[PDB]
Write a protein that binds this ligand. Structure first.
Ligand SMILES: *[C@@H]1O[C@H](CO)[C@@H](O)[C@H](O)[C@H]1NC(C)=O
Lengths: 395, 425, 409, 406, 395
């Protein structure tokens, strides 16, 4: 367009993009800043960095860039490269490891009255406190602080476009649900002087994690291992496999600890819920193995070297089985030949006595196993409910 | 320095426009002879099918504007000019991975008084070559570097392979140039063939940028030593350990433990192998084929050990030893397999009862021993059937893998070797 | 119109940003640095690099950019982009990557007397060699070395910024907005000017400003995820002494399974410890110790099982060993009577052999008791000592050992 | 040539590449947007990103770049650097990284009628949501949204590109067989193109290119499904093992070890989104629970096997169910010295008789265990077969639609 | 300084930075190149890349940049941006995947005589022929080749500053030790023409790896597994755990193979020392398992099916136990009743005979175990020494 060509030629002829767009140096540029959230790329719990794809809408008036439409064929709006005109140096104050200012210098829309609309894109990597205490049922509040880097509020004033960020074209995250979002403007003063306000706009987003991936991928196998380590106590000691079952459950828990460390964040600020439940499962399995060793020792108790204490006989043989209602447990040469037959008979007598004592020891061990099976199933249920119920009810 | 005056005359006084082709009339063609020199092969990581290479693009063309009379100046026979001052043919690697189409370092061009311009910029290229996993890790790949001129159509510039002379006859350089001294062989890959071809596509049109092509091919063979040492031999030995479950007596209650722990080790090897290969689905990799076969066979070994243990522990109180089973497993197969006064009356009644009980116990024990012999026979048959299958399968699979040399001649229908030792004609 | 426009067009007219603003020969530009730490992003032990977000404050005087306020309607401060001005080439020297410069080139605040205030933010990845001896109960001592990469001590004079006449000899951390890293906590943060006396006042490396960060790790993740499970699993080896020493006792099963679990933990920790080889980390020491203890206990289980399953046929139980261990530590009638005598004799022989078997079993039990006490003492003492050495690894009370000053505001 | 120099000097004397070419105030520039896919590089599901190597076939008309070839030795077209002419800021809007624009700035083709053609290449990383429910037997629907970042419908009018002999629009992604690499993990089922508007916003218009791609699950098939099937077979087999072997627990719990190892293998390959559970993860969890129940029932069988009258009293209902009822259904169906010597013999006989009765009751308990074990074998075989078959047909009935709907 | 401003204005007024700084085009610029190694960032054995942080010190004389200090207030040195003057295009010839030339265009020092000093920083990624034969006790020698890319020796000549690189400010690696370093200049000619030298300067560094990380992380667990391998032969067969112990040791080695795979380099040029040692450990464990299977089969042989060969009885029962010094092993109805008693006596005959034969088999198995224990301890010790001390004595 020849009209637009002439307009652009005459509109930047004596335009210095170093100078503020104010009629007088005592005035301030009023910039309307609006933030539009396009996508939540990721949340890094370990480094406490939130990555978002945004459009940073900025509006201000530049009196030097106005023209009369009647002199240029009725043109009212033109597009100019953003690097041709003065721009506000908005900086993400809580930038973690990304770009501090806008780097994509897209074209801006210039109105014949000097009103400018600039909406560059950006990737914000902002630092925010991640609270891994109820992980994976955790809610995060991560913010974006924006302000003019080198001007105070008497020279360049920024105000929010609306009280909430624009999430009209937001993409559903698939890992996070956006509970709430708002934008606030702050006035900050210093001991220097109370006539020089410093302005910032903070946008915060309340994010709730969708706890389906972590539940299925971590918590369910832990529940399985807790149940199995409880189950070990129904296995008879005669089948020489109590140690096999218990220690193989421990080995599976170790492999799954490898998996867990692969999956959950490696933070150290606090113990997550999964960390607590994993440690509880580990202690449960270890206690199960120790008590199984104790039971195996009691079951193979030699009657020749050991005699059953009276209190053990009174407790585990007399009273406890009576209260276990659901169980099904019980509540010439002829002289030499004659002497040999007598010897065989008396050896059978001794063997029978020893077998009776050993069977009493085995019965005591079996009753102890019944008690521990009931107790450990109760502990598994109580611990599983207790570790998660507070958070689940909290939601 | 007369070079300053010469360059001022060439570029400033003559009004050299670097955005205009060096042609006297806008119907001629600029011929750009290009060659590729492989500085080193960096990587062919198979997970994302990317070939990283350090190459030096050799460029050559004529520029009638950059001609001068060497006598009119001092005897200047060569100049060095930055590429940003002169017209440069933008030749880009089209099949790149990372978004790097251009050369890495824009070095000076060399200009002769006759207008001959040579340009040798170095580059790091990340081109995409698909991975053929069929014979992994005894495989050879055929990775390609495709260069196109996207700034001009074929009616304006023609790409050609550079030519060289030996005894007065020029021949095209139809290969990637590798300096035998400077080149260091890659840690994993050995280069077998390195042809170069100028490709025309007749289904396109000359007035387009998709009509011409210069492609450099790298037929490289993997060196299978890391995988043979760390992956193949331990898996083979641990797998063959499962055959010992049959030679392990059922009285020693550890047949199942041995076989299942062998299966666990094979699962660990599967975990190791899954990370080494891309996700493609053209074919199952050779090591994947072997892992599948040997895991299936170890599962068969476990099942048959379970069957043997089921047979070994049968008793007359729960099972009946039929005559058919006795004939099959106690007579036929072991031969085939070459296997190896009231008081005294009361006393008399009591001793008669004792004798009867002992006789019944002896009969019970001998029939249990018969069941044990049946189990032993089944073990021997299982070993004789499965161990040869396991050994032969492993041997056949890995000799088929070891018999996978490259075809010794690229471009199957072409009789030319494309070797630097024998240029055409 | 904006008088700033006329003022700036006057100032930058005939202004060469290549020229140091040295007024005359032998005039040295004073450049003052003040580092503000915004975020301690990470300290990657594998790469031995510390990533930080800082706002570096650089102050100097440029006599060419001075103006008389009365001539410009009382304007005493203007903003000029840093790319149009001379800048002291203050860079981070000990960067792992090639990033010497700041990240964002902010405008420079220019005062009417020539004073210039530049506050560019920067993302820095600096070299921090790792002291691996007490990992993960360790504290690191990372430093940020700042110097001019262009001008030497004869041209610029780097100094620490001074506030109210007191030198700011520390990294500034704003107490409210600063967020803890979550794995590292800052104990000391001194700042000082250093000299390389091996050089002269030339070479641009003679003088430097160093900011130190003595940070202590918070090893909660390792304790909950590695240390506690590893200790719990390793302690199981002492239980083998209460299992019976026969088939079905499963001494070897338990001990070797614990050793296999320790191997799994070895793999898990191999992914966390740094690859430097100047010291063995504390956690690596503990894994080696528990693996060696597990091997010894497997050997002892094998020895006990060998002893307890001895038989009068394979070995002879000499009375010396018993004292050492069980001490300090009609023809038809004739045929029938012959058969009865033989039966009695055979039963007697079987009982004798069995009896000597239980003798061997008792010896094995005594060995179990003694070796259990020894092994429990060994494991407990070793674990306590190893994980108590780490607990006493405290940060020094002073940032510099012989320096009495604390270097804090 | 010299005439090219003169023509370029004439064309760009007052030409401003910042100005959109509009004959009259209010005119709209027609921009044709086409796409040529050279390579579908990656569809990383962990980050929900597609990498492609593409050409943008852009064409528009610039009235300022008009000349009469008869006056310039018949120069019909020029190759001008792309930065010297106005171009619409056609960018990929749904990019995952921050790179909106093209990567390679090939120079434009300008014809004497003013028709400008531009075919830049780029490596684009667009963001498409992954439907993780039938993974890895899944088809994905990944789009590429192209529009002018700056100009709206009041300034430019987007259109579809024309074919080689421009007569009708191409409403598809163009694939050139000379330069196109099959991904090897993804098959392109449909590749339509369509223009999209927005009811709320009348100034919005884009050209979207849709790629309907189906995964080839062979890698996952092998590396997860075959071992899972083998482990399920072992879980069934544990019930054929006799309790006297002392090997049931080894088999079942080592099968559990194998399942959790396969879970470790698969952890680093499944996408971490929480909208659904991929069918492979559901199959692993079903196998894990089946193996856990095999462990539980093996413990139950071992407990029943090792019972004796000295510890338990056999209830009537167990005898009725497991000894009388089930086996036919499961096909099992089972002088002072002389007086002293006489007393000793009598005592020995009584001991043998008591031991025989005890052994008979123990055999009853062991038979109950055997019958229960066979019942578990049949039940687990049926359950495992039905579950695996159901999951496999569910996965295999997942096919991309015949009509792309776009 | 106004003097320095005027001087810089005069120096570059007619200065063309594309021309070589020679009075006559037949002359050559002499450039003194020195390399200052600051830090050895990393060595990549698999990809054969060494990354180093260096400074490329370049000195030369530019005749066009002379001035008289008296005419400019006595100024003798100035700092100029390197982009303003002719620079030598030095290229790292053996660059792997970094930058070929200098990318940090820092300022340079210029004297009044035209002498120029330029020390830009750079990150060199060089291609390094890695020898893994003696890994991790390996010494690596690899180089940095530098030269002028587009000029031959008759136009631009480069001379080393010293005989060896400057490691004055070299940070200690913590993984490598600088054994030696030197720099050599080479003249290369081509069949074209012997009047056109092509120069390069090659700096080589001899590095010795510090073998502590790999030792404690790989070799020690291999030593434990090797020691545990032969321990199964002292475990009696009566305890049903020979296979359990040996196969669990094999599983531990297989799991440790994850650590070896993730720690050692994945090159195929040669088998590393610890690769040989681990393959030895694997074959050792597998041999132990096979021979343990054979021993268990021997111990359970039944007299009914197998009869002891005469040579086995001669060797393992009579010969070897004598020469085993370490071991302590030794070297009406009445007629029916009568008939039944006779039957019991003869059955005990048969049982005693069979028990004695099975005892002989068990004794043979035990003797074989003792011999195997001695042999396997000897083999373990000898194999460990042979694998490692051969390289270790050289150090
Ligand atoms: C600044 O200018 C005013 C006139 O506007 C003059 O009176 C004053 O002396 C000047 N200041 C200096 C320091 O010369």
């Amino acid at each position: 367009s020849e009209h637009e060509t002439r307009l652009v030629a005459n509109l930047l002829e004596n335009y210095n993009k170093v100078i503020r767009p104010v009629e007088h140096h005592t005035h301030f540029v009023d910039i309307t800043v609006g933030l539009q959230l396009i996508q939540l790329i990721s949340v890094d719990e370990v480094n406490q960095i939130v990555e978002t794809n945004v459009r940073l809408r900025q509006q201000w008036i530049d009196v030097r860039l106005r023209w009369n439409p009647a002199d240029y064929g009725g043109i009212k709006k033109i597009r100019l490269p953003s690097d041709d005109v003065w721009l506000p140096d908005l900086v993400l104050y809580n930038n973690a490891d990304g770009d501090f200012a806008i780097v994509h210098m897209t074209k801006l829309l210039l109105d014949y009255t000097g009103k400018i609309m600039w909406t560059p894109p950006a990737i914000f990597k902002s630092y925010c406190e991640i609270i891994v205490t109820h992980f994976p049922f955790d809610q995060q509040n991560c913010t974006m602080k924006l302000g003019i880097w080198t001007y105070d509020g008497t020279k360049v004033s920024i105000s929010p476009e609306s009280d909430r960020p624009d999430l009209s074209t937001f993409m559903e995250s698939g890992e996070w649900v956006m509970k709430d979002y708002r934008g606030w403007k702050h006035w900050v003063y210093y001991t220097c002087c109370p006539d020089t306000p410093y302005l910032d706009i903070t946008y915060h987003f309340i994010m709730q994690r969708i706890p389906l991936y972590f539940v299925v991928n971590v918590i369910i196998p832990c529940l399985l291992f807790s149940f199995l380590t409880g189950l070990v106590f129904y296995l008879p000691t005669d089948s020489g496999e109590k140690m096999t079952l218990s220690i193989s459950v421990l080995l599976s828990l170790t492999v799954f600890l490898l998996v867990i460390v692969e999956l959950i964040p490696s933070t150290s600020s606090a113990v997550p819920l999964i960390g607590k439940y994993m440690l509880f499962t580990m202690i449960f399995v270890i206690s199960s193995i120790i008590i199984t060793v104790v039971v195996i020792n009691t079951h193979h108790r030699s009657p020749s070297t050991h005699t059953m204490p009276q209190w053990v006989r009174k407790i585990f043989i007399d009273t406890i089985p009576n209260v276990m209602f659901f169980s099904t447990m019980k509540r010439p040469d002829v002289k030499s030949a004659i002497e040999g037959v007598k010897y065989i008979a008396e050896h059978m007598k001794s063997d029978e006595e020893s077998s009776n004592a050993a069977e009493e020891w085995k019965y005591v061990a079996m009753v102890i196993d019944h008690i521990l099976l009931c107790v450990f199933m109760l502990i598994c249920i109580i611990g599983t409910v207790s570790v998660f119920a507070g958070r689940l009810i909290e939601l | 320095n007369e070079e300053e005056r010469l360059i001022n005359d060439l570029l400033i006084v003559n009004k050299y426009n670097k955005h205009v082709r060096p042609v006297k009339h806008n119907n001629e063609v600029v011929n750009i002879a290009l060659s590729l020199t492989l500085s080193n092969l960096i990587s062919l990581k198979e997970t994302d099918e990317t070939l990283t290479s350090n190459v030096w693009m050799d460029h050559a063309w004529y520029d009638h504007r950059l001609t001068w009379n060497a006598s009119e100046y001092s005897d200047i026979s060569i100049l060095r000019l930055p590429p940003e001052l002169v017209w440069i043919p933008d030749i880009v690697l089209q099949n790149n991975n990372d978004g790097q189409y251009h050369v890495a370092y824009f070095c000076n061009v060399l200009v002769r008084p006759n207008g001959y311009v040579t340009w040798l910029p170095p580059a790091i290229f990340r081109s995409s070559c698909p991975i053929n996993v069929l014979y992994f890790p005894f495989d050879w790949q055929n990775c390609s570097l495709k260069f196109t001129a996207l700034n001009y159509d074929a009616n304006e510039i023609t790409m050609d392979l550079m030519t060289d002379t030996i005894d007065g006859k020029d021949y095209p350089i139809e290969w990637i140039i590798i300096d035998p001294e400077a080149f260091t062989e890659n840690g994993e890959w050995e280069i077998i063939h390195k042809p170069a071809k100028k490709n025309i596509y007749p289904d396109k049109f000359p007035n387009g940028t998709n009509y011409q092509d210069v492609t450099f091919y790298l037929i490289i063979r993997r060196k299978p030593l890391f995988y043979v040492i760390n992956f193949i031999t331990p898996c083979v030995l641990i797998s063959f350990l499962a055959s010992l479950a049959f030679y392990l007596p059922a009285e020693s209650g550890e047949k199942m433990s041995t076989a299942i722990s062998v299966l666990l080790a094979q699962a660990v090897f599967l975990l190791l192998t899954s990370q080494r290969l891309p996700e493609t689905a053209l074919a199952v990799p050779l090591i994947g084929k072997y892992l599948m076969f040997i895991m299936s066979l170890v599962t068969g070994v476990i099942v048959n050990c379970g069957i043997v243990l089921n047979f070994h522990f049968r008793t007359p109180s729960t099972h009946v030893l039929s005559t058919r089973v006795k004939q099959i497993f106690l007579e036929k197969l072991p031969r085939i397999l070459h296997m190896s006064h009231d008081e005294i009356k009361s006393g008399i009644d009591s001793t008669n009862y004792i004798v009867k009980q002992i006789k019944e116990k002896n009969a019970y024990d001998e029939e249990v021993g018969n069941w044990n012999l049946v189990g032993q026979t089944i073990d021997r048959l299982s070993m004789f059937i499965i161990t040869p299958v396991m050994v032969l399968g492993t041997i056949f699979i890995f000799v088929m893998g070891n018999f996978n040399h490259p075809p010794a001649k690229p471009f199957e229908g072409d009789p030319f070797d494309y070797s630097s030792d024998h240029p055409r004609c | 119109e904006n008088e700033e426009g006329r003022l700036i067009e006057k100032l930058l007219g005939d202004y060469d940003k290549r020229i140091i603003p040295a007024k005359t020969l032998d005039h040295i530009i004073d450049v003052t640095l003040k580092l503000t730490l915004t975020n301690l992003i990470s300290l990657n032990e594998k790469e031995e690099a510390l990533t930080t977000n800082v706002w570096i404050e650089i102050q100097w005087n440029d006599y060419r950019l001075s103006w008389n306020t009365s001539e410009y309607e009382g304007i005493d401060l203007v903003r000029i982009p840093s790319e149009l001005l001379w800048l002291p080439d203050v860079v981070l020297e000990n960067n792992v990557d090639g990033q010497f410069e700041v990240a964002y080139y902010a405008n420079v605040l220019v005062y009417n007397d020539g004073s210039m205030y530049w506050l560019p933010p920067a993302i820095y990845r600096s070299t921090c060699p790792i002291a691996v001896t007490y990992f993960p109960f360790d504290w690191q001592n990372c430093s940020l070395v700042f110097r001019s990469q262009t001008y030497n001590a004869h041209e610029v004079n780097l100094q620490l910024s001074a506030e109210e006449g007191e030198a700011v000899e520390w990294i500034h951390i704003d107490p409210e907005d600063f967020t803890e890293n979550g794995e590292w906590t800052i104990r000391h943060r001194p700042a000082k000017k250093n000299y390389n006396w091996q050089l002269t006042k030339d070479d641009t490396d003679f003088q430097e400003i160093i900011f130190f960060l003595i940070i202590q790790r918070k090893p909660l993740f390792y304790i909950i995820n590695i240390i506690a499970p590893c200790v719990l699993i390793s302690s199981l080896v002492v239980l083998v002494y209460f299992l019976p020493a026969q088939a079905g006792g499963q001494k070897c099963t338990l001990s070797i399974s614990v050793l296999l679990a320790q191997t799994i933990f070895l793999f898990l920790i191999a992914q966390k410890v740094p690859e430097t080889s100047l010291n063995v980390p504390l956690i690596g020491k503990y894994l080696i110790f528990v693996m060696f203890v597990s091997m010894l206990i497997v050997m002892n289980c094998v020895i006990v099982l060998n002893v307890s399953l001895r038989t009068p046929n394979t070995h002879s139980l000499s009375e010396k060993i018993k004292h050492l261990f069980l001490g300090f530590l009609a023809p038809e009638i004739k045929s029938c009577v012959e058969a009865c005598n033989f039966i009695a004799k055979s039963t007697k022989e079987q009982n004798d052999s069995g009896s000597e078997n239980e003798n061997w079993v008792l010896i094995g039990k005594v060995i179990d008791k003694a070796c259990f006490w020894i092994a429990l003492l060994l494991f407990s003492i070793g674990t306590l000592a190893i994980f108590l050495t780490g607990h006493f690894n405290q940060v020094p009370e002073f940032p510099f050992p012989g320096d009495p000053r604390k270097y804090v505001p | 040539s010299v005439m090219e120099d003169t023509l370029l000097s004439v064309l760009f004397e007052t030409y401003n590449p910042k100005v959109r070419p509009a004959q009259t105030v209010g005119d709209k520039v027609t921009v044709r947007v086409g796409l040529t896919l050279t390579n579908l590089l990656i569809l990383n599901e962990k980050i929900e990103e597609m990498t492609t190597n593409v050409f943008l076939n852009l064409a528009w008309t610039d009235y300022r770049l008009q000349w009469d070839p008869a006056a310039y030795e018949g120069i019909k077209d020029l190759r001008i650097p792309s930065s010297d002419v106005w171009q619409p800021d056609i960018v990929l809007m749904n990019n995952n990284d921050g790179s909106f624009e093209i990567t390679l700035h090939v120079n434009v083709l300008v014809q004497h009628t003013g028709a400008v053609s531009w075919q830049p290449s780029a490596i684009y990383r667009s963001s498409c949501t992954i439907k993780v429910m039938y993974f890895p037997f899944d088809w994905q629907n990944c789009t590429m949204v192209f529009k002018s970042y700056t100009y709206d419908t009041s300034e430019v009018t987007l259109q579809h590109a024309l074919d080689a002999k421009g007569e009708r629009e191409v409403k598809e992604i163009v694939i050139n067989k000379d330069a196109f690499t099959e991904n090897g993990q993804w098959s392109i089922e449909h590749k339509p193109s369509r223009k999209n508007w927005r009811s709320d916003d009348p100034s919005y218009e884009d050209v979207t290119f849709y790629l309907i791609i189906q995964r080839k699950p062979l890698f996952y098939i092998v590396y997860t499904i075959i071992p899972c099937i083998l482990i399920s077979i072992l879980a069934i087999l544990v019930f054929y093992l006799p309790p006297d072997a002392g090997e049931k627990m080894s088999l079942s719990i080592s099968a559990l070890l194998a399942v959790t190892v396969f879970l470790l293998l698969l952890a680093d390959k499944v996408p971490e989104t929480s909208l659904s559970v991929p069918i492979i993860i559901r199959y692993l969890m079903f196998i894990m629970i089946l193996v856990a129940f095999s462990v539980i029932l093996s413990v139950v069988v071992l407990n029943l096997h090792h019972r004796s009258p000295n510890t338990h009293t056999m209830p009537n209902w167990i005898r009725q169910i497991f000894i009388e009822t089930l086996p036919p259904f499961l096909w099992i169906q089972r002088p002072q010295d002389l007086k002293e010597a006489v007393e000793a013999i009598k005592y020995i006989a009584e001991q043998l008789e008591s031991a025989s009765e005890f052994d008979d009751l123990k055999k009853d308990w062991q038979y109950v265990a055997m019958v229960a074990d066979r019942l578990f074998l049949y039940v687990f075989f049926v359950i495992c077969s039905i579950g695996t078959f159901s999951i496999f047909l569910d996965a295999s009935h997942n096919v991309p639609p015949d009509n792309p709907f776009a």
